[PDB]
Amino acid sequence: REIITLQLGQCGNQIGFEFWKQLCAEHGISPEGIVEEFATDRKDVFFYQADDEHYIPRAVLLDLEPRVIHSILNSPYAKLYNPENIYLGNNWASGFSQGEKIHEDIFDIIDREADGSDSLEGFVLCHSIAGGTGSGLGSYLLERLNDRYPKKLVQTYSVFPNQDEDVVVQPYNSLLTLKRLTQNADCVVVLDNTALNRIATDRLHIQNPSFSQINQLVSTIMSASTTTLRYPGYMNNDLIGLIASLIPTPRLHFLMTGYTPLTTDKTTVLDVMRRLLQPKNVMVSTNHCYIAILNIIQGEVDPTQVHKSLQRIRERKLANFIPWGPASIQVALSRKSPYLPSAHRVSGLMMANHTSISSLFERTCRQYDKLRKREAFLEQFRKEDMFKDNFDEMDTSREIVQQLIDEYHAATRPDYISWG
């Protein structure tokens, strides 16, 4: 149903601001909120129907030692939102300890925004793992959402720190936050710095300003994933029914996210499905195969081509899956948005669970272990000491992700009556 973006982390606040200006350009709205004269469709998934048809976006801004709010303040997006929703470190443990003492008023902010909405179903998070301020505070917020709301959803659109081995404290923080995301979040959409950066270097001619184009890529991905919710289709437009088909394995909830236009500047659905199953078009980094696949096609589509494309895709064995059930590739259709300022309105998306992400997780399972053996990169921060005296929480996270690896490899088998 209706979901409220909780932005946290520096890149998380960047993709939150980019997402709101993307939705301001997408919908027929002013930068005050007033309805335009070119804008019935639904505008109630992220926007409250406020005073003068002011579609005020429902959002939560969280950070520590504020940086980006100045860029919000001198912009016309301090006149679109903020009726009072903006709240003002460098390690997971420092962020955890800082979020421990101010858990009351941030939980009051969560309660205020839950009372502000009209139908609460899930809390979507626009977050960056090891963004600085996001690490630790994000995991503690995930623990608070799991403890206080077991009946609602926790969605995490997130990028994960991979530099292909830069920063020597981020594998500890990412593994601990990944354990918190397994136990305290309901669905994770995984993205990577190397995958988005490599595709950005491919489709463009940049290498240094990676952040500003990663904001555009993540905003387009998030708008494509919520296109069928914001603009009315008639399939599974609640978040619960949409993610219900998307997760085949109840512990393996990390989803591949491809996008057939890497740059948005003719084609059939067969060709973009053949494109979309290739990992080079996917922005996500032995026997690896999917468990269940679903794809969403929006544009100037002929539905009988969706028929023949599904027929040929599953029969030519490019949907690669050996499940313990019948779980399969799924087609889905969406209506492309009226009054996009973007041209070339044919666009495709895939949301599938693949075991190949386990190999990328194994790199993190290497890195922490490697940095535990050299012992000059745990850095002996005192906040890590007061977090846990035995430092066995990192071993617990390693155990949880090792169970995750064994569950991926058991889901490759036709039996899931045994995992390691």
| Interface positions with another protein (CB under 8 A) | 1, 40-44, 119, 150-151, 186, 228, 232-238, 240-241, 244-245, 248-250, 292, 302-304, 306-307, 310-311, 314-315, 319, 321-328, 330-331, 333, 414, 416-417, 419
The verdict on whether residue 136 carries a ligand-binding annotation is yes
- The residue among 237 and 337 lying less far from another protein, judged by its C-beta, is 237
- The residue among 372 and 413 lying less far from another protein, judged by its C-beta, is 413
Residue owning tokens 């002996």: 380
Residues in the chain followed by a break, C to N above 2.5 angstroms:
39, 88, 165, 265, 285
- The residue among 107 and 416 lying less far from another protein, judged by its C-beta, is 416
Q: How far apart are CA 286 and CA 262, in angstroms?
A: 28
The verdict on whether residue 226 carries a ligand-binding annotation is no
Min dist. Cβ of residue 184 to another protein (A): 10
Min dist. Cβ of residue 80 to another protein (A): 21
What are the CA-CA distances from residue 65 to residues 9, 16, 102 (Å)?
11, 18, 14
- The residue among 80 and 292 lying less far from another protein, judged by its C-beta, is 292
Min dist. Cβ of residue 325 to another protein (A): 5
The verdict on whether residue 174 carries a ligand-binding annotation is no
- The residue among 139 and 215 lying less far from another protein, judged by its C-beta, is 139
> Cα Rg for the chain, rounded, in angstroms?
21
Min dist. Cβ of residue 11 to another protein (A): 29
- The residue among 209 and 232 lying less far from another protein, judged by its C-beta, is 232
Q: How far apart are CA 380 and CA 397, in angstroms?
A: 18
Buried b or exposed e, range 193-208, using 16+ CB within 10 angstroms: bebbbebbeeeeeeee
Min dist. Cβ of residue 48 to another protein (A): 13
Coil, strand or helix at 188: strand
The answer to whether the beta carbons of residues 10 and 132 sit under 8 Å apart is yes
Closest CA to 294 of 354, 222, 224, 350: 350
The verdict on whether residue 130 carries a ligand-binding annotation is yes
Min dist. Cβ of residue 176 to another protein (A): 19
Closest CA to 288 of 218, 238, 356, 352: 356
The verdict on whether residue 134 carries a ligand-binding annotation is yes
Residue numbering of the annotated binding site for GTP: 130-136
